[PDB]
Amino acid sequence: MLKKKQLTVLDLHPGAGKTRRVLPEIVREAIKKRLRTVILAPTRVVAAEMEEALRGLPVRYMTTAVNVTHSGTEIVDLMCHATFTSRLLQPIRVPNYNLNIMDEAHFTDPSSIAARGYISTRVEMGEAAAIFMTATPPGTRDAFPDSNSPIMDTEVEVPERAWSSGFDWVTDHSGKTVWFVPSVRNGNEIAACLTKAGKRVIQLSRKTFETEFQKTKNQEWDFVITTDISEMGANFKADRVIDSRRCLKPVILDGERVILAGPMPVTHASAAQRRGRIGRNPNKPGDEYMYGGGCAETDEGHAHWLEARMLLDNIYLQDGLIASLYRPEADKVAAIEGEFKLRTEQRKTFVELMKRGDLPVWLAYQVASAGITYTDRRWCFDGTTNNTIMEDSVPAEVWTKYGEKRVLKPRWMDARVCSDHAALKSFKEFAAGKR
Numbered sequence: 473m474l475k476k477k478q479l480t481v482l483d484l485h486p487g488a489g490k491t492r493r494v495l496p497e498i499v500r501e502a503i504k505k506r507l508r509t510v511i512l513a514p515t516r517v518v519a520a521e522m523e524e525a526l527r528g529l530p531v532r533y534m535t536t537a538v539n540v541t542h543s544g545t546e547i548v549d550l551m552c553h554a555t556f557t558s559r560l561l562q563p564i565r566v567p568n569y570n571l572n573i574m575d576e577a578h579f580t581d582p583s584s585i586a587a588r589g590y591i592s593t594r595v596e597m598g599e600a601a602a603i604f605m606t607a608t609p610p611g612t613r614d615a616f617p618d619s620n621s622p623i624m625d626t627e628v629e630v631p632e633r634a635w636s637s638g639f640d641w642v643t644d645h646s647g648k649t650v651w652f653v654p655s656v657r658n659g660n661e662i663a664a665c666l667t668k669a670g671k672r673v674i675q676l677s678r679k680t681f682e683t684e685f686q687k688t689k690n691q692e693w694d695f696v697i698t699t700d701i702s703e704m705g706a707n708f709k710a711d712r713v714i715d716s717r718r719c720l721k722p723v724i725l726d727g728e729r730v731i732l733a734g735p736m737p738v739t740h741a742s743a744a745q746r747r748g749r750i751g752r753n754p755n756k757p758g759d760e761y762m763y764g765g766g767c768a769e770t771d772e773g774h775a776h777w778l779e780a781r782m783l784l785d786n787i788y789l790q791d792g793l794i795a796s797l798y799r800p801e802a803d804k805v806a807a808i809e810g811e812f813k814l815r816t817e818q819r820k821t822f823v824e825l826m827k828r829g830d831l832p833v834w835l836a837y838q839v840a841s842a843g844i845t846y847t848d849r850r851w852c853f854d855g856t857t858n859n860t861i862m863e864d865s866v867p868a869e870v871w872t873k874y875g876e877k878r879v880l881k882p883r884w885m886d887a888r889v890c891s892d893h894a895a896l897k898s899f900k901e902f903a904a905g906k907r
């Protein structure tokens with residue numbers, strides 16, 4: 473695998489030991505061969521699991537998620553997917569790693585797709601080797617891969633709202649269930665219904681994942697209600713997955729606004745990773761997978777791939793060259809390569825709107841490309857009436873940094889800034905000048 477111009481897809485089935493058995497062997501060989509190596513974890517939670525798998529090996533953990541004291545001599549670095557892409561975008565020296573290892577390489581967040589584009593381009597240029605570790609590479613059509621123990625697969629109507637009757641099989645179960653929902657708001661309603669029926673429910677989403685995931689170890693629970701973030705190496709001691717088989721798809725309409733379309737079917741890769749949370753113990757056959765819909769290739773035209781192009785257009789590669797998306801996922805976007813390349817000052821603004829601003833890539837790009845500076849929030853109030861953001865069925869209002877109460881009506885509307893109460897609170901803080 474470790475030879476230059478090699479990109480290897482390590483596609484062993486979910487639970488086959490890619491992270492705990494194969495990765496340490498790769499890392500040992502990389503150190504022996506004096507390959508400057510990067511390991512990319514999708515989340516802080518996986519970064520901490522990897523330290524356990526790699527324990528004693530000389531690895532520099534470039535994350536506060538890991539409590540270890542470095543020798544200072546490590547030639548292997550570990551960081552999050554998003555951290556790698558962020559550092560590429562910033563005026564920060566990123567080593568031209570000889571070996572690029574991405575764990576949970578199916579992750580479809582913009583920064584992960586962009587990292588795969590950058591890495592696979594460096595491999596294509598003859599500069600580097602890469603290993604992408606995932607059971608579900610891009611365009612996989614197999615929702616039911618092999619498992620450590622047999623799984624009982626059942627197609628069944630799954631509730632997406634509170635229910636009074638008709639789904640006794642949900643609550644009759646005496647084990648532990650991981651339930652994939654399409655959104656935080658949908659999970660909140662199902663969680664309230666289960667809690668009312670006497671169940672102990674933990675909710676997971678991107679923003680809450682590190683705090684709330686610990687509760688799956690520290691408290692007794694009956695259900696985990698999770699968004700798709702639990703597709704990325706989240707492990708549970710569960711015997712059932714309930715899978716809506718639904719997700720939200722961010723869609724750019726008329727190059728002008730982003731909507732959260734759907735819910736709609738998950739990809740085969742997503743379905744396989746959701747199912748793959750169970751069947752992991754060869755001594756516990758008959759874990760159950762209940763699935764409430766079919767799969768479709770809903771990544772086609774999904775905003776994350778356009779946003780990945782916006783990131784890659786702003787990453788230095790060599791002179792004016794621009795990294796391409798990883799070939800198997802390159803047709804998910806129609807973009808002119810280089811169309812989103814910004815001049816130095818607008819790029820710095822773009823980066824700050826994503827990092828400190830916590831804005832979606834697409835929205836950060838609209839603001840930065842308009843020549844607006846990071847702290848100038850006038851655009852949060854001067855949109856068309858149809859861009860009015862709502863709170864409790866009335867237009868949302870903030871006090872501006874000038875002390876004026878104004879309706880929140882952004883010039884560019886991205887549904888992700890108000891998709892749940894937490895998102896709206898954050899965007900209200902942004903519009904008021906509070907970060």
Ligand SMILES: NC(=O)N1CCN(C(=O)c2ccco2)CC1
Nearest residue numbers: 533534535536537551555558559
């Ligand atoms: N660019 C980032 O957001 N990184 C996370 C913090 N980084 C470390 O190396 C680190 C902090 C504590 C122990 O390691 C640098 C990478």
